[PDB]
Each structure stands twice: as C-alpha cells, then as structure tokens.
C-alpha cells in the first residue's frame, strides 16, 4: 500500500528503519531528538503534548499512510520533538532519516502539496479535539470523541459505521480524560438505547446523526 | 516586497483585493465561508480560536508578509473560516481568490515547500502561545508573551531587542488574558527593573536570557 509510493517517483536506494511497538509504548518523547520521520504502515499513533506540569491532553489520533514527527525538520529552527507519540493499536511504522525526507521534497515538490493538505487535515483533527475536550460533561465529550472515530476511521456498513479500532475501555479514558469505569457505565447507557453496537471490542454506530443529537 | 514573489515564477494576470482594517477589526469570523485566501503586507493579524461559550483564546500572532485563511481551502474539505482574524495593529492585506491559490500549488509546487515550511512555524508559535498561557500566574505568562514577540517580532540594538510593534496595554491583555491594569503594574514593575524600556508604544528587552530567568 505505502510501498505503491515508494516505487513511483523511485530509481534509486532509500535506507529506513521498520519498527514495530505494541499498545501503549512510546515511539517517541518531546525533547527527544528528532533524528527520523515516521510513516504509520499498521495501526493508530496518538499523538499527546505533554504539559509543563504532570498533564497530558491528546492533540490527534493517526490514521493508517500518515506521516508524523516531522514538524522539528520542516520549521527548519527546532531540532527535537514536539509531542509525545504512543501507539494507540499495535503499530508498524517507517523512520526514515530526516535527511531523505529533505530530497524527497526537494527534488518531487508535488510531495509538499500532498504533505501540505495532510498537515491540515491533521489541524482539523486537532480543532475537533478541542472542541471534544472543552464540553464540562463526560456524556458530550464520548459522543464528540466516537463522531470523530467515526468520521476518520469508520468502515460504512448496512449495520452502521464500524469504528474500524478494537479499541479497550481504559484507552478511551486516557484519550478522552475519564475513567475505565465511566466510559464503561456510558457505552451500556447507549449500548441499551440502541445507539451502539460493541462486536469483539470494535464500535459500530448506527446513526451519527442520531448519536450527535443528544448533550449526553 | 511581497510583489518582487509576485513578479518571478510570473507571466500572467493575478485577481486580488487589497484590504486595510483598522485596529482591533475582524477580518474574518469562524463560521464565515472562506472565498478567498490572505496575505499580511503590513501590519499584525492576531488569530484567535472563539470557543463554543463566549470564550476567545489566542492561537498565533502573524508578522508581515505572512499567509492566512488558507486552512479552510488545504484541507480540501471544509469550506469556511477556522479562526478569528483580527487586525492587532493598522493591517495591509491582499484577498486573492481560492481558485488561484490552487493554481500557483498545483503549477510551481516550490510553493508548497514554502508554505508547508512556513505552516510549521506557525504551530511552533502556537505551542508557545500555550505553554505561554498555561502559567497560573500573570507574571510568568506575560514573560513568555514578550519573548514570543522578541523572538518573532525582535528587531536587534544595541540597546536590546526592540518589539517593534507600538503596542497598547489594553492589548496585551485581551492576547495574554488579563487587565490594562495588571499589565501597566507589571511593566512598571519591569521597567523599574531595568529589564524593560518604553519608547512611543515600542518595548526593548535589554535582555532576554535576564527576563526569562524569573518566575515573575
């Protein structure tokens, strides 16, 4: 799938590094330095800026052929990283040397235009998480957090949109900032009024419309 | 200066509106559509993001011959305004349709090598303006505000960095969240510091790294 890009605009040797961590690892930590940019091949990355105190507010959640931690290269000022990348799902990712990533863009510009709309929607994101965070109840907050889910990582099906995740009660919390128990006693309240339906631990919506429409 | 872009990578005709706001004037509001991008000739355009209640909290701060209102357009799938754009001094401006903006991307995409570069300061700066803000206390957050603007708005002296902005108090408050009372107290307390100069409306930091190092 990623590779399909590789072999276009490609007669040459490219050196990378697969990496492959397992839920809840750090890939990489702000202040560390950034050395590689990475390529999400498998998985969700969840991207957190972790606060000058203890917190830890969650900025985006990444989504399969998505590019990160790169913003320390393209300023060009700022040579260490900006968040702090965990793998939300088991992840398999591409570090290539920021080095190459320079060349890249540089000697095939349309990849600036492509990597300049991916950078925006990415902004959206983070303006929807925002606006998730900002609701005083747990309730609303849940609902903004699956329409969102649902918007980047839903597969349309006749049952619904399936939150294509497999995703544990304990990692919406601290995406979310609640507790395993809360999100628990949430998720049975609309699972049993028929707004969603939980298979193996994938989420699928019936109606989006309909689960917007409720300050709960 | 911004016409001497225009002129190179040139050999057509250019639809554009110049436009002058006065201070403290919105340019655009969230939820306005967005029909055409802008470009800061002269002046400040402060950008703020107007939270669901009544609340509105400064994102960026943009420095002349910078580019604005083309998030909406990047993202090729929303369609209307993300922020609040307010003229900070006497702003120049030129309003160029959407349309064009995606001819020069897509025709010399050395563009979007520019302006992918330029966006990622623009969220460096964003992450100051929070780290900036998140400071319980006034002092500390008024602080990092100045070093915000030496940093992106310094002009070098021997007398020190000069924020070359011409900047009233009442200002810096509705950007940093506070009073045109608590702000005149602090200056004064700076001033007879012997950190700070006044001159006109213009702020010299002797120092920097003497500033910085004060959690006050």
Do not use: W
Request: hydrophobic content about 45%.
């Amino acid at each position: 799938s990623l590779l399909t890009m590789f072999r276009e605009l490609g007669s040459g040797k490219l050196p990378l590094q697969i990496e492959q961590f397992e839920r809840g690892k750090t890939i990489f930590f702000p202040g560390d330095p950034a050395e590689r940019v990475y390529l999400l091949v498998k998985g969700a990355v969840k991207l957190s800026r972790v606060y000058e105190s203890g917190e830890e507010i969650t900025v985006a959640l990444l989504r399969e052929n998505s590019v990160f931690g790169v913003l320390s290269l393209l300023t060009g000022q700022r040579s260490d990283r900006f968040y702090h990348a965990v793998a939300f799902t088991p992840v398999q990712l591409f570090s290539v040397p920021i080095e190459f990533m320079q060349k890249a863009l540089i000697e095939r510009p349309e990849l600036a235009n492509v990597m300049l709309q991916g950078l925006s929607s990415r902004i959206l994101q983070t303006e929807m998480m925002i606006e998730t965070l900002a609701h005083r109840d747990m309730g609303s907050r849940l609902v903004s957090f699956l329409l969102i889910l649902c918007r980047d990582f839903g597969i349309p099906s006749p049952d619904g949109i399936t939150i294509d995740l497999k995703l544990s009660h304990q990692a919406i919390a601290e995406a979310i900032g609640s507790t395993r128990v809360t999100v628990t006693r949430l998720l049975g309240d609309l699972r049993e009024s028929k707004l969603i339906a939980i298979h193996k631990k994938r989420i699928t919506v019936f109606n989006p419309v309909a689960l917007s429409q409720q300050f709960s």
